[PDB]
Write a protein that binds this ligand. Structure first.
Ligand SMILES: CNc1ccc(CCc2ccc(OCCOCCOCCF)nc2)cc1
Ligand SMILES: CNc1ccc(CCc2ccc(OCCOCCOCCF)nc2)cc1
Lengths: 34, 34, 34, 34, 34, 34, 34, 34, 34, 34, 34, 34
């Protein structure tokens, strides 16, 4: 009697342009110097 | 008698332009120096 | 009585253009100097 | 009574153009100097 | 009573053009100087 | 009662053109100077 | 004039014994059927 | 004037014994059936 | 004026004994049936 | 003015004994049946 | 003004004894039946 | 102004004894039946 479907997970749906910095979807630990 | 569907999770729906800093969707620990 | 289907996980759905920095979908540890 | 199907995982769905930096789908450890 | 099928994992679905930097699908350790 | 089939793993589905940098599907250790 | 040190992040400090279920330190997306 | 040191991140500090289930430090996507 | 050192990341510091299940430090996608 | 050193990443610091299951340090995609 | 040194990455620091299952440091794709 | 040295990557630092299963440092694709 269990049913799971059509989940959805997005990080950056739209466009990413002319980036000159640091774009990170998921970070664990770690250092960022933008 | 259980049913789950059509969930949805977004972090940045729209556009990301000319970034010069640090954009992070999910961070655990870690240091950021923008 | 268990059934899972049609999950979906995206990091960058749209386009990525003229990047001059650091774009990272998932990072564990590690240092980034943008 | 178990069944899993039609999962899907993407890192960069759309196009990647004129890149002059560092684009990384998944990083463990390691240093990036963009 | 177990069955798994039709999984799918992609790193760069769309096109990659005129790259002049470092594009890496999965990195463990290692240094990148873009 | 176990059955697995029709998995699929891709690194660069679409085309790769006019590359002048370093495109790497999977890297363990190692240094990249793009 | 900036200095950060001696941070610390733990998920399971003590012991984990005779587990018969699902113990997960950090989960993003994904389904768990315990 | 920037200095970061002596960070530390642990997932399971203590012992793990007689496990009969699923112990996962970090999971992105994916299904677990314990 | 930047300096980073003595970071540290561990997944299972202590011992792992008599395991009869699935112990995974980091998982992306993928199914686990313990 | 940049300097990084003495990072460290471990997956299983301590001992691993009498294993009868599946111990995996890092998994991308793929199915595990313990 | 860039310098990186003395990084270190380990998968199984301590001993591995009397294994009767599947111990894998890094897996991409692929099925494991322990 | 770039210099990298004294990196280090290990898979099994300590001893491996009386193994009766499958120990694999790095696997891409492929099936394991322990
Ligand atoms: C607030 N809590 C917190 C906790 C932890 C952190 C950072 C942890 C970390 C761990 C490792 C790392 O780098 C690994 C370098 O591995 C390159 C090996 O390269 C091999 C070439 F052959 N960086 C950072 C930050 C904050
Ligand atoms: C409430 N929002 C929400 C959002 C998302 C989710 C789940 C997302 C997800 C994505 C992928 C996945 O599985 C990937 C299977 O990849 C195996 C490929 O194996 C290759 C063998 F060769 N599972 C779950 C749940 C909830």
């Amino acid at each position: 009697g269990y049913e799971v479907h059509h989940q959805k997970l997005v990080f950056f749906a739209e466009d990413v342009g002319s980036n000159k910095g640091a774009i990170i979807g998921l970070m664990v630990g770690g250092v960022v110097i933008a």
